[PDB]
Amino acid sequence: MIQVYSRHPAENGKSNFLNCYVSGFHPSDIEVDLLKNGERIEKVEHCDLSFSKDWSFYLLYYTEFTPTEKDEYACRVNHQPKIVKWD
Amino acid sequence: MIQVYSRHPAENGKSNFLNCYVSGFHPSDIEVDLLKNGERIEKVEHCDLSFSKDWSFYLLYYTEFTPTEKDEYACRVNHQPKIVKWD
Amino acid sequence: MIQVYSRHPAENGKSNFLNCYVSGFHPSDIEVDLLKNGERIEKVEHCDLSFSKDWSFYLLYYTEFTPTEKDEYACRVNHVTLSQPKIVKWD
Amino acid sequence: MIQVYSRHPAENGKSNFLNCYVSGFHPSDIEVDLLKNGERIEKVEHCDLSFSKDWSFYLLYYTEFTPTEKDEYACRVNHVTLSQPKIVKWD
Ligand SMILES: *SCCNC(=O)c1cnc2n(c1=O)CCS2
Ligand SMILES: *SCCNC(=O)c1cnc2n(c1=O)CCS2
Ligand SMILES: *SCCNC(=O)c1cnc2n(c1=O)CCS2
Ligand SMILES: *SCCNC(=O)c1cnc2n(c1=O)CCS2
What we know:
The structure is a homotetramer. Chain A is mainly beta. In chain A, 0% of the residues lie in helices and 57% in strands. The PDB classes it as immune system.
């Protein structure tokens, strides 16, 4: 499960936060990235939560950004990787 | 940081939950256990939370138990291990 | 946002959990309900997280259910913001 | 429970965070405040987590502070349960 969204609704030229929420199961060699116009963003902060009861994990990758008319943002998940754009 | 407590206040003979909350920093090869009269309890459930922003982790180890007059419970943390009794 | 989903993938006849995740700003007059064929379910528990700094809130409304082909499940959210309460169907 | 602690170990003169963690049952008339020398701090934000299933609640009240030897910091909790409001000092 992958959900991509901005902390606040977007005004171009106003600093904001982009978020990728990811959920899954078991032990797993999964990796996550935020993209700007198709290239990986570096120093992306995350939040990792896991529960032994059901081998479940919950990940939120987030970054400061200033949304612009030009720029295209996405979130990508590999180990094949699945890309979810923001809108 | 280690905090040991029962979900509900204890009536002997009533099923309850014992909890060990542990907090720390950085990457780390730390391990955690709940003890009954000094021996490790098996199949103990946990909750692991970590944040990249400050290399911080937060762990809650919990188990069903029926508190008794006889039995002594603790939480132990190694990698030396530090033992915190419940009361 | 509002997201409706089953804990595990859905097999008709098999016990599962239905979840309504709702996130926003100014909890305020926020009400959330899970419906089965338009009627409120009484098994419904929830998990409320809120932060004072920015009046941000995160809600999970959940219940045990046994999904069937005939049955329709939905989540209902009403807020000062919305002209009319919002219904989000599942699958 | 009530636990008062600094985010990082305390160096006099150095910016830090003070935290008051409060957990219980029936949030109800729960009020929580951080004091500096007996006076409420206005920088105070909080993080509220609650579950309907068992009326269980987990609160973190926090603020930026610069600890000094002279200054006394505390957390104050009042509840229907308590005869009188409880003050827990830090360190
Ligand atoms: S992940 C555990 C609680 N923290 C957050 O959710 C969190 C913390 N800091 C920041 N964001 C968060 O979502 C993103 C914008 S700043
Ligand atoms: S750790 C994330 C949220 N879950 C809990 O805190 C949790 C879940 N289930 C059970 N307990 C919890 O504390 C212990 C008794 S049952
Ligand atoms: S009540 C806190 C546990 N749930 C979540 O944090 C949660 C669950 N589902 C989804 N998100 C969450 O943050 C991300 C978007 S959908
Ligand atoms: S607002 C949720 C983040 N804080 C905690 O979950 C938390 C913080 N500090 C301590 N405990 C927590 O659960 C365990 C006992 S002290």
